[PDB]
């Protein structure tokens, strides 16, 4: 089973996660194996049946993912009114703060490899028919071997292709901001911004702009400028992710083949 009994969990750090969540780090006892470092996300006491239902579906979809660039579910705690999601521990945490704290320490090739990994995770996810809706370097986690994994499936929904939510402005496609239409193509817009963050080593997107300036400038056709050191094909790929017409944006499959080509024959 994936249900974990509470005494198997050792907790050493607990942090607020917005309004009614917390995130913990610690270790998990695993029968006949060394203790496994884990991250945990949980609902705090007082949650509604609805939050419980959404939380447990998030756990349920995550549990079906099996890919090198998708965070692994270790298991769940659901008994006795607890609701925690236990995932593999990622030594180097969030990608944006990781690069920010190691500024200039990687080669462009290593940074492209990181991006290709995020791209592979998103291709896996979109092929299954999920839209993420919250893709950002803050939600990409880094392991000890610099492997990037897509995380945080709380806003993830299945498509039929679009989806309406009955938002993080700097990473969201304008059609999703404006009309709440989320698609694999709006995740592709978000991926472009991630590409930008990575090449800028965790610089804040549109750092010179207020939120309302972001919305109006982007619809007027403003695009993030290439970060220093960014290869021309990489910038072009970003710009393509940011087409005004969602149908003109590359699909993740194409994004991955483009990155693979630049890893194989560097420009």
Characteristic key phrases:
monomer; 267 residues; alpha+beta; Transferase(Phosphotransferase), domain 1; two-stranded antiparallel ribbon; 11 strands; 35% helix; 18% strand; transferase; kinase; phosphorylation
Report on this model:
The PDB classes it as transferase. Keywords: ATP-binding, kinase, nucleotide-binding, receptor, transferase, phosphorylation, transmembrane, tyrosine-protein kinase, Structural Genomics Consortium, SGC, Glycoprotein, Membrane, Phosphoprotein. The assembly is monomeric. The structure is a monomer. 35% of the residues lie in helices and 18% in strands. Strands 1-2-3-5-4 form a five-stranded antiparallel beta sheet, covered by helices on one side. The protein has a two-stranded antiparallel ribbon with strand order 6-9. Strands 7-8 form a two-stranded antiparallel sheet. The chain has eight helices and eleven strands. The chain folds into two domains: 1-89, Phosphorylase Kinase, domain 1 (2-Layer Sandwich), CATH 3.30.200.20; 90-267, Transferase(Phosphotransferase), domain 1 (Orthogonal Bundle), CATH 1.10.510.10. Strand 4 and strand 5 form a beta hairpin. It starts with 8 loop residues before the first strand and ends with a helix. The protein has helices at 49-62, 95-100, 108-127, 174-179, 184-199, 211-219, 232-241, 252-264, and strands at 9-17, 21-28, 36-43, 73-77, 84-88, 130-131, 140-142, 148-150, 157-158, 163-164, 181-182. It is α+β, with helices and mostly antiparallel strands.
List the helices and strands and how they pair.
Layout: E1 9-17, E2 21-28, E3 36-43, H1 49-62, E4 73-77, E5 84-88, H2 95-100, H3 108-127, E6 130-131, E7 140-142, E8 148-150, E9 157-158, E10 163-164, H4 174-179, E11 181-182, H5 184-199, H6 211-219, H7 232-241, H8 252-264
Antiparallel strand pairs: 1-2, 2-3, 3-5, 4-5, 6-9, 7-8, 10-11
Binding site for ATP: 15-23, 41
Cytoplasmic side: 1-267
Subcellular location: Cell membrane; Cell projection; Early endosome membrane
């Amino acid at each position: 089973t994936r249900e974990i009994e509470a005494s198997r969990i050792h907790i050493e750090k607990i942090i607020g996660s917005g309004d009614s969540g917390e995130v913990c780090y610690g270790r998990l006892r695993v029968p006949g194996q060394r203790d496994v470092p884990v991250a945990i996300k949980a609902l705090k006491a007082g949650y509604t049946e609805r939050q419980r239902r959404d939380f447990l579906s998030e756990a349920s979809i995550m549990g079906q993912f099996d890919h090198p660039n998708i965070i692994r579910l270790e298991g769940v705690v659901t008994r006795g009114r607890l609701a925690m999601i236990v995932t593999e521990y990622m030594e180097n945490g969030s990608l944006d703060t990781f690069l920010r704290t190691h500024d200039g320490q990687f080669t462009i090739m290593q940074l492209v490899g990181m991006l290709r990994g995020v791209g592979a995770g998103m291709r896996y996810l979109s092929d299954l028919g999920y839209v993420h809706r919250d893709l950002a370097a803050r939600n990409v986690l880094v392991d000890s071997n610099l492997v990037c994994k897509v995380s945080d499936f709380g806003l993830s929904r299945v498509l039929e292709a679009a989806y309406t939510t009955t938002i993080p402005i700097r990473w969201t496609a304008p059609e999703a901001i404006a009309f709440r239409t989320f698609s694999s193509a709006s995740d592709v817009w978000s991926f472009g911004v991630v590409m930008w963050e990575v090449l800028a080593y965790g610089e804040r997107p549109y750092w010179n702009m207020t939120n309302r300036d972001v919305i109006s400038s982007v619809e007027e056709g403003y695009r993030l400028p290439a970060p220093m050191g960014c290869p021309h094909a990489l910038h072009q790929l970003m710009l393509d992710c940011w087409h005004k017409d969602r149908a003109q944006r590359p699909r993740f499959s194409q994004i991955v083949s483009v990155l693979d080509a630049l890893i194989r024959s560097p420009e």
